[PDB]
Amino acid sequence: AENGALRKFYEVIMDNGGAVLDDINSLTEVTILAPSNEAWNSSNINNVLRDRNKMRQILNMHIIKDRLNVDKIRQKNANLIAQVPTVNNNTFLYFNVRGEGSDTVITVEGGGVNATVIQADVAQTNGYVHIIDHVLGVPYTTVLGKLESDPMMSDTYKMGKFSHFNDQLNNTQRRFTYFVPRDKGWQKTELDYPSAHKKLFMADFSYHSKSILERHLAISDKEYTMKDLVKFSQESGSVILPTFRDSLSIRVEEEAGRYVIIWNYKKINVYRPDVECTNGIIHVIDYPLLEEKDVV
Ligand SMILES: *[C@@H]1O[C@H](CO)[C@@H](O[C@@H]2O[C@H](CO)[C@@H](O)[C@H](O)[C@H]2NC(C)=O)[C@H](O)[C@H]1NC(C)=O
Numbered sequence: 001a002e003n004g005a006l007r008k009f010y011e012v013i014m015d016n017g018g019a020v021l022d023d024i025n026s027l028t029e030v031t032i033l034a035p036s037n038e039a040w041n042s043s044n045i046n047n048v049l050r051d052r053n054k055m056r057q058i059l060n061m062h063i064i065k066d067r068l069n070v071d072k073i074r075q076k077n078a079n080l081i082a083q084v085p086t087v088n089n090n091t092f093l094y095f096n097v098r099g100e101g102s103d104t105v106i107t108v109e110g111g112g113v114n115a116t117v118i119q120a121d122v123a124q125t126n127g128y129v130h131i132i133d134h135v136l137g138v139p140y141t142t143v144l145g146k147l148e149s150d151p152m153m154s155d156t157y158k159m160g161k162f163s164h165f166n167d168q169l170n171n172t173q174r175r176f177t178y179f180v181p182r183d184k185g186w187q188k189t190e191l192d193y194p195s196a197h198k199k200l201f202m203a204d205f206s207y208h209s210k211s212i213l214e215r216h217l218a219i220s221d222k223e224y225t226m227k228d229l230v231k232f233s234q235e236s237g238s239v240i241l242p243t244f245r246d247s248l249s250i251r252v253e254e255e256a257g258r259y260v261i262i263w264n265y266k267k268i269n270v271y272r273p274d275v276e277c278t279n280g281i282i283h284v285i286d287y288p289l290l291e292e293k294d295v296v
Pocket residue numbers: 094095096097098107108109114115149150151
């Protein structure tokens with residue numbers, strides 16, 4: 001697209017303030033992820049498109065406070081995954097790069113959205129511009145849809161299959177807040193409790209794995225953003241959320257920009273907070289809510 005995409009990006013900025021344009025021009029380095037025109041339409045963001053306050057938040061997360069081209073992205077993700085900050089100080093992004101040359105496939109994950117770069121390295125004065133096929137910050141998948149499409153959630157998604165725990169996550173009549181342990185988290189659990197870990201991924205113990213996951217799943221009429229949990233555990237003592245057959249009592253705090261979860265005697269870092277979905281929100285955590293009282 002490019003031609004159509006960029007003008008559309010600016011048109012959207014015009015409809016919602018213009019304040020966005022100020023922040024962009026006040027940056028020494030800036031990289032914009034401009035959704036294709038097809039992305040701005042098929043997104044059917046008709047709902048939020050009218051909310052000028054939200055549109056600004058959506059627009060802001062498409063603006064990277066840095067000079068980032070394909071090469072730089074590849075490099076930054078060499079050792080670990082680089083979480084890239086945006087104008088939206090409540091949303092960061094990160095990329096995944098596959099193949100090389102004309103076979104290169106670049107995708108980005110942000111605000112609950114996974115988009116593919118359909119055009120990259122468009123030069124700019126202080127940076128670059130890339131065209132993506134989806135509008136970040138506007139989920140087009142349910143919690144379940146996300147779980148099957150996010151490689152980082154592969155273990156938790158697979159574990160929820162043995163007991164058909166996942167089935168329910170497609171329901172649009174409820175709102176789920178799923179605290180999803182990332183793959184690295186389950187791998188760590190494998191080192192801590194190799195036998196119990198082998199069991200969680202066995203049909204024979206579907207009951208156990210379901211019980212473990214239901215502990216991570218909050219079901220209510222509303223979804224809780226990490227910022228909500230903080231406010232709750234701040235005004236009140238801790239936070240109490242309804243799970244499937246019981247409840248979840250945790251406490252959330254801010255720590256050097258990241259959010260932290262205090263469950264029982266454990267402290268787990270929230271790796272990807274607020275991964276919004278159409279029927280809820282997902283919070284990727286560093287380690288699963290597990291004590292060795294569920295292992296022996
Ligand atoms: C966005 O979603 C896609 C689709 O699931 C992810 O693509 C996979 O990426 C892994 C890691 O390179 C590959 O092993 C798979 O083969 C890819 N699937 C396909 C068919 O494309 C992609 O990684 C996600 N992007 C992010 C940043 O999470």
